[PDB]
Structure 1
Amino acid sequence: DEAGITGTWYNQLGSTFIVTAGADGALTGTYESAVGNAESRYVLTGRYDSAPATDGSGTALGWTVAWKNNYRNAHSATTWSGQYVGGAEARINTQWLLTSGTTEANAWASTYVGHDTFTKVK
């Protein structure tokens, strides 16, 4: 599913995920968040299963954005872990962890958890 994953994806917040899937399992591209302490595009990288099961299962994948670019630095990183599901209404269904750099006293509150669903439309 190199073909299936590569391209522009959109989540329920209106964020834009632009990815290229490599034959080797690499994910590279850019992320633009519609929310939070974010402006414009941020580098992403990640990995995907380049030889998924042929029993109708999804394709496992994940990627990271560190929220620093030329405009802003939110001193934080998000990882998305999920699976690509192909077909007429292709989706990437994810859960994510957003960690901030914190002092040791605040480290208990360093990490948000959430879920994003990406589609090829909207």
Structure 2
Amino acid sequence: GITGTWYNQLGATFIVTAGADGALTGTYESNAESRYVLTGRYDSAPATDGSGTALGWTVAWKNNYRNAHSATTWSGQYVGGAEARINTQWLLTSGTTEANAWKSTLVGHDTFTKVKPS
């Protein structure tokens, strides 16, 4: 299932818990210095025709050591299987002035698995 410790293709660590009511809660680490709170939602009653499980979550990149004045949201689906994975697309929006709002948002794609790259 979704609950557990996941790693993306860059070594970041996604420690998540999926609650019964549809919640996602946890920590995202890019040690404690580099660790941040997360929260999100997931479809707690997915289709039964082979489709994956829809979900999303948010990290604001502030903690007690640093603040980058930004937030990433990941939107994706869990795909169960021999090598379970969470395939996401993400949007990183930074706090900008109006003048710089056109370049406020980065987009990318993260694949999470249970194994950490070397």
State the TM bucket, normalised to the shorter chain.
Answer: over 0.9
Deviation at 1:39, TM superposition (A): 4.2
Q: Secondary structure at the match of 2:101?
A: helix
Residue matched to 1:68: 62
**What secondary structure is seen at the aligned counterpart in 1 of 2:70?**
strand
In the alignment, what sits opposite 1:110?
104
Structure 2 runs not aligned, ≥5 long: none
CA distance in 1, matches of 2:115, 2:70: 28
SS at match of 2:20: coil
The CA RMSD over aligned residues, in Å, is 1.7
How far does residue 87 in structure 1 lie from its aligned partner after superposition? Answer: 1.4
Runs of 4+ with deviation above 3 angstroms: none
| Residues 36-89 of structure 1, C-alpha deviations (whole Å, 9 max, x = no match) | x99421000000000000111000000000000011100000000000001110
Percent of matched pairs sharing the same residue: 97
Deviations 1:9-43 (A, max 9, x none): 0000111000000000000000012xxx9942100
Contact 1:38 1:74 in 2 (8 A): no
Work out which of the residue numbers 24, 28, 31 in structure 1 matches 2:28.
31
Unaligned runs of 5+ in 1: none
Structure 2 distance, partners of 1:74, 1:31, is 14
| Larger RCO: 1 or 2 (CA < 8 Å, sep 6+) | 2
Give the TM-score normalised by structure 1: 0.92
TM-score in terms of structure 2 length = 0.95
